[PDB]
Amino acid sequence: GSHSMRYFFTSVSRPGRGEPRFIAVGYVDDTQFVRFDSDAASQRMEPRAPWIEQEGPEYWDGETRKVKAHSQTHRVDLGTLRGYYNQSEAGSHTVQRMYGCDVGSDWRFLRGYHQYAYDGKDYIALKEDLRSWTAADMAAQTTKHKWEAAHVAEQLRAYLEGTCVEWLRRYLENGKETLQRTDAPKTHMTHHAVSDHEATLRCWALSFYPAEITLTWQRDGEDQTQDTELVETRPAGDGTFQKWAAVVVPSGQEQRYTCHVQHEGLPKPLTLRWE
């Protein structure tokens, strides 16, 4: 399994209603492990997975230190962006940032990210090379220049290839039961008659980890991609995900349709049928 640590930060200005809000969450694969929310009593980085709790005063203090410094930078960022777009002081705005790293199955550095958006649109993004930037517009280009000059990407490689990878692995090591598991999907199908001449056939995938899964319906071998209702993979709230694919069969045609489920935890992918 390939693994990833990503961190997500959201800053939203509240004109008149104080300091902006900064929410920070971190993730290893589909498991969230930490959080920070400006509007909280705490004002500390909190654990959100059992395996990080044990870490230590030092861990928790340093991450509180850093997340609060990130908080302040994103709210210096917010005013600068207002200037770069010479916007009102009355408007709310949202910046969002996401950085992290991916390791393959051998747990070595595979990919490094750092992207930044403003008002739900790309603003600037480090490229896979981890030295150059993709500046969306003129403003993102001023910013690009600034970071070119201060050699910020040189410092970025240090974190995403050293520390991010180092810690992700530590996190895999230390959260082994959660993080190195692969819960294979529990599949089954439903049949409810929509009418006299047609019926819904729904293929379920339940209690699985990681979220990556393909749920495909077929009729006589033909892909049914234009005719499948596919819901988005949702969380069950216990660290597993759920998903379903449905088709409306002309009655009598049930034995033509086959569901197909592919997930990291399934030795060979499943083909299911109503019979």
């Binding site: 920070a24 980085m45 340093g62 991450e63 410094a69 960022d77 770069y84 930044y116």
Partner: peptide, 9 residues
Amino acid sequence: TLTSCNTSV
């Protein structure tokens, strides 16, 4: 673990 970085746009 978070980066310690204070670079703004």
